[PDB]
From Swiss-Prot, chain B:
GO terms for biological process: mitochondrial electron transport, NADH to ubiquinone. Disulfide bonds: none annotated. Belongs to the complex I NDUFS6 subunit family. It is a peripheral membrane protein. Accessory subunit of the mitochondrial membrane respiratory chain NADH dehydrogenase (Complex I), that is believed not to be involved in catalysis. Complex I functions in the transfer of electrons from NADH to the respiratory chain. The immediate electron acceptor for the enzyme is believed to be ubiquinone. It comes from the Eukaryota. This is NADH dehydrogenase [ubiquinone] iron-sulfur protein 6, mitochondrial. Complex I is composed of at least 49 different subunits. This is a component of the iron-sulfur (IP) fragment of the enzyme. GO terms for cellular component: mitochondrial inner membrane; mitochondrion. It comes from Arabidopsis thaliana (Mouse-ear cress).
From Swiss-Prot, chain C:
Disulfide bonds: none annotated. The chain holds residues 19 to 45 of 143 of the full protein. The lineage of its organism: Eukaryota, Viridiplantae, Streptophyta, Embryophyta, Tracheophyta. It is found in: Mitochondrion inner membrane. Belongs to the complex I NDUFA13 subunit family. This is NADH dehydrogenase [ubiquinone] 1 alpha subcomplex subunit 13-A. The gene is MEE4. Complex I is composed of at least 49 different subunits. Accessory subunit of the mitochondrial membrane respiratory chain NADH dehydrogenase (Complex I), that is believed not to be involved in catalysis. Complex I functions in the transfer of electrons from NADH to the respiratory chain. The immediate electron acceptor for the enzyme is believed to be ubiquinone.
Curated annotation (Swiss-Prot), chain D:
It comes from Arabidopsis thaliana. Its main location: mitochondrion. Induction: By cold. GO terms for molecular function: cobalt ion binding; NADH dehydrogenase (ubiquinone) activity. Disruption phenotype: Leaves have a reduced capacity for cold acclimation, appear water-soaked, leak electrolytes, and accumulate reactive oxygen species constitutively. Sugar-sensitive germination, delayed growth, modified respiration pathway, and altered stress responses. This is NADH dehydrogenase [ubiquinone] iron-sulfur protein 4, mitochondrial. The chain holds residues 35 to 103 of 154 of the full protein. Accessory subunit of the mitochondrial membrane respiratory chain NADH dehydrogenase (Complex I), that is believed not to be involved in catalysis. Complex I functions in the transfer of electrons from NADH to the respiratory chain. The immediate electron acceptor for the enzyme is believed to be ubiquinone.
Curated annotation (Swiss-Prot), chain I:
GO terms for cellular component: cytosol; mitochondrial inner membrane; mitochondrion; respiratory chain complex I. The chain holds residues 46 to 110 of 159 of the full protein. It is found in: Mitochondrion inner membrane. This is Probable NADH dehydrogenase [ubiquinone] 1 alpha subcomplex subunit 12. Belongs to the complex I NDUFA12 subunit family. It comes from the Eukaryota.
Amino acid sequence: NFTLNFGPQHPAAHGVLRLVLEMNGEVVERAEPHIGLLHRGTEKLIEYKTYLQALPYFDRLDYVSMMAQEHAYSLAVEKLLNCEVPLRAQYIRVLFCEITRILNHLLALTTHAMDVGALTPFLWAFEEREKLLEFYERVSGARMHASFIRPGGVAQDLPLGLCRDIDSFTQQFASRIDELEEMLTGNRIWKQRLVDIGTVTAQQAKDWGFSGVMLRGSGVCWDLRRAAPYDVYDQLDFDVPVGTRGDCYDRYCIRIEEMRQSLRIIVQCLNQMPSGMIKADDRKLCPPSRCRMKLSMESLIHHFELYTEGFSVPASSTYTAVEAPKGEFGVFLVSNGSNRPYRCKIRAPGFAHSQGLDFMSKHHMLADVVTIIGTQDIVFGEVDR
Amino acid sequence: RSKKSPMELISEVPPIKVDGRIVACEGDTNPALGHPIEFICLDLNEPAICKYCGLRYVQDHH
Amino acid sequence: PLLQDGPPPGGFAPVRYARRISNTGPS
Amino acid sequence: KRGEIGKVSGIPEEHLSRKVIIYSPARTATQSGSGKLGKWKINFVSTLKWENPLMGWTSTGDPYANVGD
Amino acid sequence: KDWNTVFERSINTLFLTEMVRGLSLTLKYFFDPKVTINYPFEKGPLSPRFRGEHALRRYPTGEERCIACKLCEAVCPAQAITIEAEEREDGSRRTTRYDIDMTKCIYCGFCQEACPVDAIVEGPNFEFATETHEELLYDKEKLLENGDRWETEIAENLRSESLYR
Amino acid sequence: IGVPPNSANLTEARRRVFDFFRAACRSIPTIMDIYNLQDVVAPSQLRYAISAQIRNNAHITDPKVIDLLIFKGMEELTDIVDHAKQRHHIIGQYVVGGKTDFLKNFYTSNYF
Amino acid sequence: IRRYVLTKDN
Amino acid sequence: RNPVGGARVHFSNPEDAIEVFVDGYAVKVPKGFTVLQACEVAGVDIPRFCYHSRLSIAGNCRMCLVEVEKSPKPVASCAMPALPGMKIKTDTPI
Amino acid sequence: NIGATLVGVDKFGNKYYQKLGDTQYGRHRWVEYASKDRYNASQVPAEWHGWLHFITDHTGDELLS
Amino acid sequence: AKVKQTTGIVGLDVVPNARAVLIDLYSKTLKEIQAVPEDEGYRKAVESFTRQRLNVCKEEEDWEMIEKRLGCGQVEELIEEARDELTLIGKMIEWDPWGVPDDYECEVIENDAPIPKHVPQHRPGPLPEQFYKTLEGLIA
Amino acid sequence: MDNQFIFKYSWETLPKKWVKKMERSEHGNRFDTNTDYLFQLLCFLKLHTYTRVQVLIDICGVDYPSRKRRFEVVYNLLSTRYNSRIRVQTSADEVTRISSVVSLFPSAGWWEREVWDMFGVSFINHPDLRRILTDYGFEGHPLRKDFPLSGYVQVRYDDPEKRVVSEPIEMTQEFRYFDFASPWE
Ligand SMILES: CCCCCCCCCCCC(=O)SCCNC(=O)CCNC(=O)[C@H](O)C(C)(C)COP(=O)(O)O
Ligand code: SF4
Ligand code: SF4
Ligand code: FES
Ligand SMILES: [Zn+2]
């Protein structure tokens, strides 16, 4: 058999994808993904930064789901600090994590359908993506890389009209999802290009470290928001969709259902969000108000010490994982008692999913390899740090 | 008037007359939009300079 | 201050989240 | 010196013949605290620095410019 | 199965009854108002918290607010700021060199929220693409010009988030 | 296939060195074709280059260090066999190559 | 921390 | 445990050496050391503002106040001489 | 620029228009540049920049005072 | 009463007979754990839970009832546990790790630093009673 | 199911000669074992009925230059059936070959390749142990504490040579290290 190379440099498929395929005829026999083109030394750069200075690195890991990584990093720091977060901050974090989940799912579904050949749903979904990123631009000052979720509480408070605008969005996102489904779900070509492609058994998913939609499509009811709940996720009502055949079509139906349930969670968070402060009151770990630093001596001392040295995490090590839109995103943070992390491994779900591309694509058509790559929803920011 | 450096511009503002022996300088009418509060002792003959603003305060009567 | 972002009194109006059926066509 | 680990590490041969100083940094004279004491450091004596003739920034060509610190 | 069900699903197979339902959906969006904006004339909505081009502010008296505390250079996660300071002729603590690398800047706003005197701010300007790399090495004069040119909008925005910061 | 278990004595280390050297020597014909080295280098100068590397790394007496050196050399050989590295790279590494040294260094710079 | 050390204990 | 900053205590004789309990730990110090110095031998570093090891003692700032069992009020560790059998407490609520 | 209200004029001569939106918006805040030579793509002063980008509701004539 | 239509798990297939493929695996497990020394913690637990599950599989004829009383997965997730325990027994026998060293020592650190409540924590429900019965068997 | 139950069960059932350090806390129940018993422990913890750990989350290394056994290899494990996490750690220096667990967990391959690339730890019986993240021909293991942050070599285009070439590194602005440590810690 010959040795064929797909390097798509154009971001019509990821952009830094490099597959070296061994094709017998039209079937592919082994898929070896060549990674390392987006390895920017993020893990080593964390060890040279303060715990506050290393927060923006997590925005650029999974650049389609930004708040998901910040939530995990903040939870790891809180676990190593035993820092309690106010209820309003927890509700805001859950709200902006479920907005993030919808953003990631909307991008993934349509960048996967564009690979197949469906161009129309891509623009329709990016319209709602822009509508959602407007909310990102409102709380923070950045459309994508918002350093909003922070270890103590949250960076700053919500503008006045944000809740009303988010409710107005949720009044029509259901019809938007209905249109997006009606363009793809009933189509026979979409069924023929997804059904029975990429079948994975539950044992294979467990052995290869699959998580999220890749794992729940095989029948495994494993959600980290229900197995190891964090924040206020245990006070919210939402269902966990589970697949039956493990193919690419189940990964798509579940990726629809997880976004409808995300809309449901967003509505509940809007309705039940309480009043109060948005940051922990231990100003030894959180910044003082700008009116208090210019009027009180100890507040100014705290500001000065926090914005140069930052806080010091007691010597310990732990692993915290959250339910990122791709799957289980974990951070292994090691502290030696100083103001800089000693070691911080980033466990990316894409790393464990692109590794299993070899067995998912074996004995499949060449044109069926792009659907297998797109159904895993891989971004290379996290695959190679 | 770009030819005037900020030093020359802050050297042209007349000192503020204060009746008491001490004045508090915040840097702006709205406290939250200025610099940290600075208490200046007006017990000399030369005008007393704010170390943030550069504004000068002088005692009015005594 | 004491005027903080949140839901209006009585909560927000209910919003559909399930699939709406479409029976279009004579068949 | 049995620098076998240096040979199986990946450090270039030019940087494996450096002369270093092993010392314990002392307490600063401007503070009375004694927290940053008891740790030992390796000083690579990295002094070859110059000035960028575009912005005045400090340029260097020594990889071991800040590792030991 | 049932004859009626078999016939009904066989008609849909041969009459493409699930592609007409998508063609109708596309045609409905064809006759529909567009959502595109004329970028040169009309701009997209923004927020007062927008983190754009940096600007160094000055007091209304004409004195620059920067006090060379170097509190923004130590919080900068990208090491994009370099500050050199000394005692000015009046004896005040001011900067001689204040330059920001906008090719290293990640536009995170940490410098803006760390300044104790509101000297460095990220203004609303986001249209400053240059034709040369050295034009992106902003210095003190360039930053002060930015602060003077965007002073009113920056002041209004700082008034807006005074209730939140 | 799999990474071999760590050696227990110097004789096994020597055997692995010889096996790796033989494999590298058999890899010489492939490199001359994958890269246009036909009218560049004799088929023995490269062989001498690998021999020289083995010989100037021949003062090691720790079997673990020898095994690690062999593993790194095998990784380098496998990379060179593939089209991974650029052409001039091997030609920049694998080619065999007056007053006072002190006075020339003094004329060059203060940092010896 | 309760770092007691186990032993064979016959 | 080691003294703070690797401080070397010079015992002129083994006989003139009292015993104190800085935090329940047996500490041997010569007669003449203060509570602050005894704590420095036992690895505990007391806050200080006005005390300098090369200057005369002057208990101004009152920042090195510790708890002593046979004391109704906190004592300035910089100036209080160490007594045999004295139990110092530094991390108590007082 | 049809069925629209002119909010104000600029020192460079740029005219700013506004139209009322109902539920979906579109062409409700734009500029008619007084130049045509490529218009430089950036000629809006700081008093009018905020109004155009919906940062502030002040027109810019009111932002001057 | 009827045969299980689907297991709900991809790759795992319904076994038409589950009371006869489990009563044999448990018997094999009990007849092969004998090679392990009597006073070892592995043998006691592996011979306790295997006896209870074997008795349960002998009492009730229908798979639904077996699923109810054991209450730990489907009968198709118990066969894959029995077949793995059988493999583990053989691997233990060939490795023979049963020899307690004379110089053995273990540092049992016991940390108690609390963690916050919003922090993700794995909180399962109460295990079936056998998971504790085997535990008291091991301690005793 | 829980840290209180898993600790007590593994105390009794596990062979004593394998594990030499057992921390039980809320940050995570850890097991520290010798490198010659790692595969045995992980195979036991993958097949036992009450400790069905079927998911290997990741394999990471930690660099401690002050220790004799410099590198610490951490195996974060997950049990889906009992909803519990277990962490297993070993220690290895720069010239020891620890056993590979790709036989038990197929996902261990890329993590072991990344550990070898980043720290230089070699794994016995690994189907293919080559660098996975660093550039082709990369020399040195970057995630070591003695490796400089910016590395040793730099990449630029050489017009006369008509190819991208590698040159010794030379920064226009060096990395400024700020020492914020406090003496009153
Ligand atoms: C294009 C090809 C790509 C790959 C080329 C190779 C690149 C790596 C080159 C190898 C790197 C190494 O150091 S790997 C080999 C290093 N290992 C040793 O040198 C073992 C110590 N030497 C001895 O024991 C003896 O001197 C001995 C020399 C054996 C003979 O002498 P005797 O038997 O009398 O005793
Ligand atoms: S915005 Fe962030 S990266 Fe840019 S100069 Fe300020 S602190 Fe540095
Ligand atoms: S801009 Fe602000 S933070 Fe930066 S040096 Fe000047 S006063 Fe300090
Ligand atoms: S140090 Fe000031 S009272 Fe003792
Ligand atoms: Zn002032």
